[PDB]
Design a protein around this nucleic acid. Structure first.
Length: 76
RNA sequence: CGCGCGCGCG
RNA sequence: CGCGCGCGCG
């Protein structure tokens, strides 16, 4: 849904996992639905033992929502 | 963030 | 004309 205004989800996760001594997350598009004029995307984020998904009206939004979810997973 | 070219839509 | 997608660049 929403990421905090002016926060950098993908870069923050990348920087966090580097400091935990983990390899960089892997992002893959794992779903696309709807017509070409109202598309929705799902990105999967994988790092260490975790797998979290994010979705959005664009791939960039989907990926940012995937990173946010992963940040929540790793920090909690 | 902004722009070009190409594609698909509406 | 927009939303999106691909490529590319600042």
């Amino acid at each position: 849904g929403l990421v905090p205004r002016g926060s950098h989800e993908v870069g923050a996760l990348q920087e966090l996992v580097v400091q935990k001594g983990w390899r960089l997350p892997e992002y893959t598009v794992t779903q696309e639905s709807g017509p070409a004029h109202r598309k929705e995307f799902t990105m999967t984020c994988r790092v260490e033992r975790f797998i979290e998904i994010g979705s959005g009206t664009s791939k960039k939004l989907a990926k940012r929502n995937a990173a946010a979810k992963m940040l929540l997973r790793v920090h909690t």
